[PDB]
């Protein structure tokens, strides 16, 4: 996954679209938190709120398209 490709970009967009529930073009703690809970996984909406508060470039408390596409390409083969 280290090398970029069509799949990769499309992958980021897909994942992004899934999180942006309100569909405002950005992801929020509540938006993701809901997705994390509905899935039945760690509903620690607190952990995210804290993590987002950090990666948040504008400090708006939301994750933009680029950030997600980046923080996801950090590792994982």
């Amino acid at each position: 996954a280290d090398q970029l490709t069509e799949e990769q970009i499309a992958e980021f967009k897909e994942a992004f679209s899934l999180f942006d529930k309100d569909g405002d073009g950005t992801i929020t703690t509540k938006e993701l938190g809901t997705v994390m809970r509905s899935l039945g996984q760690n509903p620690t909406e607190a952990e995210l709120q804290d993590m987002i508060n950090e990666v948040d470039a504008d400090g708006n408390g939301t994750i933009d398209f680029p950030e997600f596409l980046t923080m996801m390409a950090r590792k994982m083969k």
Partner: peptide, 24 residues
């Protein structure tokens, strides 16, 4: 320490899992 990346990846994996299944 770490855990942020895992949470992000775990959510994506589960999110897609639901997408493939087509549930809800």
């Amino acid at each position: 320490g770490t855990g942020a990346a895992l949470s992000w990846q775990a959510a994506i994996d589960a999110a897609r899992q639901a997408k493939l299944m087509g549930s809800a």
